[model samples]
Target: KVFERCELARTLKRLGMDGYRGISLANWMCLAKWESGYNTRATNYNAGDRSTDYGIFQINSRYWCNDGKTPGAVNACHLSCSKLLDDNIADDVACAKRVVRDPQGIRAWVAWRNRCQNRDVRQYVQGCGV
Candidate 1:
């Protein structure tokens, strides 16, 4: 499912991403925009580390989900990577929550740092009424 900008913002807000772990809804919106463009089934394979990123947040197999192929993966999210590809973002959101619990917070996604961090992200959620 590829979500519209405000559609994703409202959805993320309803999923309790508005102020999760000091990260604002706009930041979350920005992250999703750059990470997967709000596409639920987005996946990117990393040839360098032999891992893959899954879902809207681009959660990685190396440290989050288990793909049964990533070497030395940690599976901190304790879920199969396949779950992150479904239309239901509930699992993806839950796993993202667990990911931010670490010291890195939302910085777990490099795209957020490069695109959303310290930038004007209000446009992402401005008209969403979230």
Candidate 2:
């Protein structure tokens, strides 16, 4: 569990946002469980533009990372070394959380995510991690 939260927490601290320590792994995990069933290998079931995203958090690299040119346009950096902070799981999470504080309210972001991830089993997450 520490490893998991550490991954999330490390990102938070890196961006000088320790105030979010309360939310920690739970926040990232809730999204992980609901969207990808905690499967870092998960992918969407819908069609293009309406497709499921990837990674533990199911981030759509296209919008966050690419500015819409293409998926890997993450400036040629791999998921582990991305500085754009939205190309893969860890970085994308940092960007998402920083902007929203409680990103669950970003209607545009949430809508884009939930529209594709409307799996209807949030109860699986128990609490919102918020």
Candidate 3:
């Protein structure tokens, strides 16, 4: 589902995204923009690795989730990746919380690595007032 930038900022704040795992909301918002553009239905299939990224956070099936049909998946979240691809972000937030707790922390997301890390993301939440 698509949402306005401000609405997304507000929703993410309500979902407890601010300072989640010690990462700022602006950083996570930057991640959402680069990873999925806030689209819940976003999916990135990497043929070379045969893994897929799902939803707003682009949670990966390789370690974070399982597609049920994919054998040998390290489903740490113990849920389907499809759960992230919906309008309701509750599941996504739950799964992301787990991801944040992992050893890699939020840097598990390449979007965070390439775009948000060590940046001043305060601008992301500026107008949203989140």
Reference-based lDDT, each prediction? 0.91, 0.44, 0.86
Better of 1 and 3 by lDDT: 1
Query: What tens-digit string does per-residue lDDT give for candidate 2 at 1-130?
Result: 1224445445444655433534433344445555555444655533565433555454555544333434444422234313332333456556555435444533334533654344443343334242
**TM-score of every model versus the real structure:** 0.96, 0.42, 0.93
What is the model-wide C-alpha lDDT for candidate 1? 0.91
Question: Which residue pairs overlap in candidate 1's backbone?
Answer: none
lDDT of 3: 0.86
Clashing residue pairs, backbone N/CA/C < 3 A, model 3: none
Instruction: Give a tens-digit lDDT track for model 1, residues 31-106.
Output: 8889998999899999999999999889999999999999999999999999999998989999999999999899
Worst 10 residues of 1 by lDDT: 121-130
Best by lDDT: 1
Worst 10 residues of 2 by lDDT: 76-85
TM-score-better candidate, 2 vs 3: 3
